[PDB]
């Protein structure tokens, strides 16, 4: 973790809460960001949020309460970004 990337997924009635589906540090983080550009997936920079998610919510885990509001804000941004 010079570089961190956290991939969040939310789909109604499927994921009960936002789900971390993938994470990466360093080269893998860089690759995730490059793949995001290729697939036009919204990417948002937030240093303390990225660190906290990386430390606390592992791949395949749902976010916990302390993350509800910041992640909810990210998802509201994302779903209309660059339309």
């Amino acid at each position: 973790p010079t570089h961190i990337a956290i991939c969040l997924y939310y789909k109604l009635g499927e994921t009960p809460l936002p789900l971390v589906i993938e994470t990466g540090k360093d080269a893998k983080a860089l690759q995730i960001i490059k793949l995001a550009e290729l697939y036009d997936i919204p990417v948002i920079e937030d240093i303390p949020l990225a660190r906290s998610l990386y430390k606390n919510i592992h791949k395949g885990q749902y976010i916990t309460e302390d993350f509800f509001e910041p992640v909810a804000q990210l998802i509201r941004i994302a779903i209309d970004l660059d339309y």
Partner: peptide, 19 residues
Amino acid sequence: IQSTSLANNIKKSTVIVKN
């Protein structure tokens, strides 16, 4: 292979957060 499997996973993502 990682890259093609990472892509196949990643591509459904709603949002990616980075530092």
